[PDB]
Amino acid sequence: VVSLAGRDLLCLQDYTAEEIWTILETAKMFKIWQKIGKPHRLLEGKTLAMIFQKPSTRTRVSFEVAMAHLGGHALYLNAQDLQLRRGETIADTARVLSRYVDAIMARVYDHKDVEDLAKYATVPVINGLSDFSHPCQALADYMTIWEKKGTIKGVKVVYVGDGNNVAHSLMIAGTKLGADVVVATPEGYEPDEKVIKWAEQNAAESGGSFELLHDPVKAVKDADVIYTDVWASMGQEAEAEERRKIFRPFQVNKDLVKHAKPDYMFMHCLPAHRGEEVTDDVIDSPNSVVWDQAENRLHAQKAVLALVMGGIK
Amino acid sequence: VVSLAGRDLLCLQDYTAEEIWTILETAKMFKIWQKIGKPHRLLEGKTLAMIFQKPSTRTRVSFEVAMAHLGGHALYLNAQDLQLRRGETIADTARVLSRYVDAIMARVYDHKDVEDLAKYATVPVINGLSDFSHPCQALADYMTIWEKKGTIKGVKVVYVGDGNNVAHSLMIAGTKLGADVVVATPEGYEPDEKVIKWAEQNAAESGGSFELLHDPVKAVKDADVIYTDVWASMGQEAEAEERRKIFRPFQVNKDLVKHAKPDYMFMHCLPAHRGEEVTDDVIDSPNSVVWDQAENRLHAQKAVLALVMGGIK
Amino acid sequence: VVSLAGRDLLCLQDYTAEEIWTILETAKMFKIWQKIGKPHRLLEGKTLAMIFQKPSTRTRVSFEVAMAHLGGHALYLNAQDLQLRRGETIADTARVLSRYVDAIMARVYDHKDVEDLAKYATVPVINGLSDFSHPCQALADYMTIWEKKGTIKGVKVVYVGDGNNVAHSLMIAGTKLGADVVVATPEGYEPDEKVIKWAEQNAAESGGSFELLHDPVKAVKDADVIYTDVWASMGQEAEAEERRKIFRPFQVNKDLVKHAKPDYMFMHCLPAHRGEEVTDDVIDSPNSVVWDQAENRLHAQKAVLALVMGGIK
Amino acid sequence: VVSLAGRDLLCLQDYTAEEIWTILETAKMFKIWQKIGKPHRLLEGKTLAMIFQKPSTRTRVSFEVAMAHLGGHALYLNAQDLQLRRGETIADTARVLSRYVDAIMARVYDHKDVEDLAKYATVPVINGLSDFSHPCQALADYMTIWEKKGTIKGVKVVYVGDGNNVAHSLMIAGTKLGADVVVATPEGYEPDEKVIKWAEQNAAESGGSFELLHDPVKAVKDADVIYTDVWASMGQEAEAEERRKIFRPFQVNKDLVKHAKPDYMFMHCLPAHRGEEVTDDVIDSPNSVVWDQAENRLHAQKAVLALVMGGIK
Amino acid sequence: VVSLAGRDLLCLQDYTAEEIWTILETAKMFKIWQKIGKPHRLLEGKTLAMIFQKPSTRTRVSFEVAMAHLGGHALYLNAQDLQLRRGETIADTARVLSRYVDAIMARVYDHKDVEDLAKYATVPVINGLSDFSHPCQALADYMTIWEKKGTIKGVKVVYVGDGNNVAHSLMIAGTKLGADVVVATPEGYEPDEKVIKWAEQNAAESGGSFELLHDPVKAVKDADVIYTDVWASMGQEAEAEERRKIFRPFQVNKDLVKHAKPDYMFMHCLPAHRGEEVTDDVIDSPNSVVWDQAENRLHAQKAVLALVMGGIK
Amino acid sequence: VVSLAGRDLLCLQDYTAEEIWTILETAKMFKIWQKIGKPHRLLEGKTLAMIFQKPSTRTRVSFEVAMAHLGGHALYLNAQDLQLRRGETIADTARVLSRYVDAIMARVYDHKDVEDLAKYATVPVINGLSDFSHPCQALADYMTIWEKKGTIKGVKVVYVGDGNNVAHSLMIAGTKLGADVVVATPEGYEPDEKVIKWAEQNAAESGGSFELLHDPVKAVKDADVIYTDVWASMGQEAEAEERRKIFRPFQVNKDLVKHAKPDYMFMHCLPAHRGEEVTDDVIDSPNSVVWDQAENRLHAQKAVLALVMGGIK
Secondary structure (H helix, E strand, O other), rough: OOOOOOOOOHHHHHOOHHHHHHHHHHHHHHHHHHHOOOOOOOOOOEEEEEEEEOHHHHHHHHOOOOOOOOOEEEEEOOOOOOOOOOOOOHHHHHHHHHHHHHHEEEEEEOOHHHHHHHHHEEEEEEEEOOOOOOOHHHHHHHHHOOOOOOOOOOEEEEEOOOHHHHHHHHHHHHHHHHHEEEEOOOOOOOOOOOHHHHHHHHHOOOOOOOEOOOOHHHHHOOOOEEEEEEOOOOOOOOOOOOOOHHHHHHOHHHHHHHHOOOOEEEEEEOOOOOOOOEHHHHOOOEEEOOHHHHHHHHHHHHHHHHHHHOOOO | OOOOOOOOOOHHHHOHHHHHHHHHHHHHHHHHHHHHHHOOOOOOEEEEEEEEEHHHHHHHHHHHHHHOOOOEEEEEOOOOOOOOOOOHHHHHHHHHHHHHHHHHEEEEEOOHHHHHHHHHHHOEEEEEEEEOOHHHHHHHHHHHHHHHOOOOOOEEEEEOOOOHHHHHHHHHHHHOOOOOEEEOOOOOOOOOOOHHHHHHHHHHHHHOEEEEEOOHHHHHHOOOOOEOOOOOOOOOOOOOOOHHHHHHHHHHHHHHHHOOOOOEEEEOOOOOOOOOOHHHHOOOOOOOHHHHHHHHHHHHHHHHHHHHHOOOO | OOOOOOOOOHHHOOOOHHHHHHHHHHHHHHHHHHHHHHOOOOOOOOOOEEEEEOOOOOHHHHHHHHHHOOOEEEEEEEOOOOOOOOOOOHHHHHHHHHHHHOOEEEEEOOHHHHHHHHHHHHOEEEEEEEOOHHHHHHHHHHHHHHHHHHHOOOOOEEEEOOHHHHHHHHHHHHHHOOEEEEEOOOOOOOOOOHHHHHHHHHHHOOEEEEEEEHHHHHHHOOEEEEOOOOOOOOOOOOOOOHHHHHHHHHHHHHHHHOOOOOOEEEEOOOOOEOOOOOOOOHHHOOOEEEEHHHHHHHHHHHHHHHHHHOOOO | OOOOOOOOOOOHHHHHHHHHHHHHHHHHHHHHHHHHHOOOOOOOOOEEEEEEEHHHHHHHHHHHHHHHHOOOOEEEEEEOOOOOOOOEEEEEEEEHHHHHOOOOEEEEHHHHHHHHHHHHHHOOOOEEEEOOOOHHHHHHHHHHHHHHHHOOOOOEEEEEEEOOOHHHHHHHHHHHEEEEEEEEEOOOOOHHHHHHHHHHHHHOHHHHHHHHOOOOHHHHHOOEEEEEOOOOOOOOOOOOOOHHHHHHOEEEHHHHHHOOOOOOOOOOEEOOOEEOOOOOHHOOOEEEEHHHHHHHHHHHHHHHHHHHHOOOO | OOOOOOOOOOOHHOHHHHHHHHHHHHHHEEEEEEEHOOOOOOOOOOEEEEEEEOOHHHHHHHHHHHHOOOOOOEEOOOOOOOOOOOOOOOHHHHHHHHHHEEEEEEOOHHHHOOOHHHHHHOOEEEEEOOOOOOHHHHHHHHHHHHHHHHOOOEEEEEEEEOHHHHHHHHHHHHHHHOOOOEEEEEOOOOOHHEEEEEHHHHHHHHHOEEEOOOOHHHHHHOOOOOOOOOOOOOEEEEEEEOOOHHHHOOOOOOOHHHHOOOEEEEEEOOOOEEEEEOOOHOOOOOEOEEEEEEHHHHHHHHHHHHEEEEEEO | OOOOOOEEEHHHHHOHHHHHHHHHHHHHHHHHHHHHHOOOOOOOOOEEEEEEEOOHHHHHHHHHHHHHHHOOOEEOOOOOOOOOOOOHHHHHHHHHHHHHHEEEEEOOOOHHHHHHHHHHHHOOOEEOOOOOOHHHHHHHHHHHHHHHHHOOOOOOOEEEEOOOOOHHHHHHHHHHHEEEEEEEEEEEEOHHHHHHHHHHHHHHHHOOOOEEEEEHHHHHHOOOOOEEEEOOOOOOOOOOOHHHHHHHOOOEEEHHHHOOOOEEEEOEEEEEEOOEEEEEHHOOOOOEEEEHHHEEEEEEHHHHHHHHOOOOO
């Protein structure tokens, strides 16, 4: 294990497999503490400023509950209080905030904002969701796979659907952890080339693999976990619901799933659009693991805060 | 007294008189603890997610202060973060939330929502206000009557004005507790028939009574407590202020009150529209009890949280 | 030092120099406690209701972090939950709130509102910002000057730009503390005459001085600290950016500053509009003290809460 | 309330109504503490020797759990370890035991034994069950009636079946508490005359009443609570199951019960012989209260130990 | 890991591999805590009623010591106090007991009794030994194999001798955990067909295997652990010591063992009948692991109590 | 004083006078702690397994109360749970028990059993009573003499009656402590020759003495303490009450006692058979000290547990 004291968590490609393992182990520990009822208020009086430039309840309550469990306090800054680059330069808000709080967690559209926030920060900055990546989710996801499957190594996890931020992060972490990851997406909707390049170099070292495809049924062959997420042009509606014809084939359903292992795990980072990317039969099939996966958002984030704030000096 | 560990509080007709008494006694106890300065952080590290689909400060601060006193933490979810049936099925948000928090308190329009929330919950669900009922208010109200009057039994409490959610709850509880309750409302504005039926069966058992009327001065005869609330077509304005001509006669004022006992108590669940349902002379007369009644919202809710979360197993 | 138990903090002209010194000393103490890592949860279970009628992050997080450090809890009431004089008379909300919380801190436009709030309160009311004054800022400001300069007495602090609320408060406190204060503003934009009168009577007693001027370069002569703030017709834009021609001469820049002492301190209460009232060269010059000044908002407010709530009886 | 420090609890006729009320109030308090999860280890290191001359699980686990909750320790002495008058004079075992433990609770056949035990004791002696009386059960019983019914005063509690030890105690307490008690038993099986005499003198003072009868249906008329217990010649079997013909008419069943109030409570001190003294329809009817009644054995005994051992001097 | 809060432990076929792993991990943790001397009284004031319908010291002291370590209290109910279906219906004793204690652990002959106990319970019920299964032993056993061998997966554990309750449980767990399990028994003495069917379906999923045989030397080939237990017609004696001729060939001895791996582990759940199923040379050979295995009964049960009682809500 | 950490207490001839003094001093200390109400839970979480092969309440409750006072837990194993050499070799039960508990205290017939128990133990073994000796009683006895008489040295303690286990131990300790001990017994009923030899060698070193006699009146001449115990063929009854004619002369009574010092102390280890070995006049004469002596069983054993378990390493 290694110290992460004072670190930022913008993107996992900055992390070594050992650092990402440090967080999963501490998280497993905290999860057990919690199941047996053992208190662990390790951050009394510590404060975490959560800046939300676009709502997200799962992230807001998982970070807020995580801090409460550790005895600290998360303040919730909204878009009606905190636009970033509007009433003051991002550098200035970072400077002042770092005089009051102990760590910042930002949920922002433009990844460059969370990056600017970190550069002038002085206090650890965590990325709860940007358009480029979602690290906290990957940690929860691989934590889940690790719990259920017993290992992350030779597991074929395949993501089907639009290549977005969580897709990026599933690639970066799994490939760093040694998993054989494959992503299948409609032709013009594949992950950013930079992260694809990343995924391949990462893969060499962890004897994992990465593989882009454009045919779901091929991708999902003999899969251990099938993962999906909501799809493109979010806010599209009938007035550009085009995502339907193109993405529709990718919908995780009874038939697609049939190509995976009998004991495959279905994952989705929520929210689900039952009917689109996934059907009732799947999310609710006993192969579904969406809730344990949701829960691990609490444990995993509980570990990164303790690790990056607790290691004080 | 009885355990309420794990129970939901959607409507008091599900509660026995003993269960409602359990909460009032624990509440009286907590109120005394508070007056003498004795701490009682019985829920350290416990979290309560408050979902507000429509604002309400009295409820928001009474639940939030109640949890702070017990050492726990209430997270406040707004309408800009949490519409219910919009970005995800109510069943799904209930499932995920119940993986993070320890109890949910919802303030929603449609009572069916709080009901759906409870069905998929796994964690206790409390109804802070729906269009059908307001249990937390009745508990505070009867707690107040119990304090001041010394008993709830043979007390004639009469509600005058539109038959709404608090009207429903005043009927359900008082009639369960043995009070002689009467509700007087303009002809087309009387409580839901289902709760009226409830009130009558309940009344048989607690030797109380219920009685619908349509003439305030008759209703308020020899009354111990006269209760009122804001009136109909809320948001009506001059463009359908019709509530004026019809409801106006019901306005609790110096003359109406004159028919009640000399030592009658005036109650209102706030907010007051001084000038409409009640006049300055009344809410501010020494017969008014609106503030002690407001305060008991803290003590009563402090008891239901401790009772339904504290009794853990 | 003196007790401030139960006091309100609407405006510092109500305070004696000893009372304002009591708060600065307690604040210095709390700042040292904090630097050495010594806990001081003096207000466990205490709650502070923050009413924001107009956003302000620096105030919101400084009060919220201050209460967390003391072990209490601040509830944040927004404009979407709490308009003041809309759904209920300010007297009524004050009455009910004072049945739940231990102190109220209001950020409101009309100073008369914070004044009405205090009159019906029962619980201490603190003014986090009104259009007439900003006491919490002056305390932080003079605390900063006291730290850096070693004294407040014979220090010439000069404010340049529109005479607003913070201008009012810089005058009232500095002049009460014995500083030689001067305010320079464009001809039709000078501080309220009432506070100017105040500043002069105050000055007699503390052998300080006050002096209105309309020429920045004269004002800033041999100055110890040069202070500025954002300027007039806020929300003006190009459609009445008139503030430009008139205020432009007042812009704190390399040349203006050149008239001050070599070791002068530049202060600004933030937010800064780099380019308008101040330029990059100044706020970022090593003479700038804007961040220590921002930080002292935490320590100073931490002292007023402890002082006005801690002294319980 | 009054001190019971150092007292013995052999029979309730030695207790005043105030003393029996002291124990019920302390018990109600402890019950609430328990429902909210508030610890109360008031007897750390204290030990209670339980002597069982004839098995009884309900008593053994209720006393043992009660002491664990208070942080003390109950040692369980069986008939294979402790016959009383066999290997040593009862006076001698009492003397030695009182050098080791803090209170003794004995479950013995001959009431004279528990009486001898107390005479040489030095340490409080509690009677968990003798052939003459069962005080701990009456306390639980009247506690239950008090909880459910709201008072003990004008409540008609009627016991039907063999007049035994619990019958004795129901008479002694209820009549001391002001209840209108009636006992109906087959002709040759009525309570001891001494306790019947007691019941009548007691009744005068508490405006209650007592009344022996020999016709169940008459006895149960308009009853609030109908109570029964197992019946005569225990161990009789077919070889003297005579109790059948004679007692059979007394069996609490659907028809008998029909004469009581609609909201009557059915009580039984357990064990039940479903089929004999009571039928499935009754013990399991929602009018049955046998389990809350069983539970109150814990709370009531928790109060007598705390009261008679806690009040140390 | 997963919550087991409120669960019963009658048979491990109800448990997922993850749930059984949750308990082993928590157990490993508690074992380390214990070796370093770190306290963990996680269940203060909690009580566990142990019902023994047939003696068993190893189980009685392991559960009793486990609860003492956690700060709770186990009450021991014997056959002289608690026959089940004798003086009262099993449903009734379950109801009353669940009003006093926090969990029940039963050691009974007929598995249907422990099943009935759980159905009317309200409080978690643990099966310490029935004629169908012994879950607590399997957990200890696989915990031991996991410690020593480093994994449970590809380990060939073979059980030789009468197919009884522990045989059932070794099959159910090992096969659920992925081990290659084989059971060899004399022709008419093989495990129940239902559990054999279970073992095979379970095996498919955990890439383990199961295999019934009737020739010990074949069974023990290349085995990692050789397990045995006492044999048939217990209480048989010379007057039906028939078990001798038939079972004798199965006796684990120097020769049989010789077919296993050099580093094989010998396990037995005790009591041993040195001379029958195993010889001095084996139980005492350095390949024997019977005591570490016995010890893990403490750690494993310490984990299930903490897990099923500690996770309170 | 000296450490006794990890020691066994089978027989006091293994102990030096300093070791036996270490225990008496620690015992005196614990007795004072207890009289002033000072807690001393020195063995939290520690467990003591008491194995009783033949009942004994005084020993069972003194060890059980002693452990409760120290915050540990004694488990009571009976003859219906633990025969020693029946269902498993004594070596095996010792091995397993020593994996669960922290010390063992055995009450067994055959001293060789307690000796075998200790040989395979790993955990301290204490002998609460065997047929050869009763160490815990001697410690209490000499503690008593030490308290009352002020010293043990030149005190003539004489034992009259059958030479049994306590006789053995009175000889071994007193003679080790320097007392002048004499034992008088009917001709064929004198202490084992081995311990008599012991007593004489021991006596040389502590300038005490030992002396066997067969005439009580001579023995009791000028005695400081006269000690007796129950007599021979226990279970004899009229069908071999022969002990009467032979032992009768030895009965401690008014006349015999008359030969002792005026301030002599009468001791008996209980149980007393008032009428046989001693008469009412003696055990109850103010010269009797049987109860203080009984009480010191608690203090003395409280010291050996703390000493042999507390000194951990």
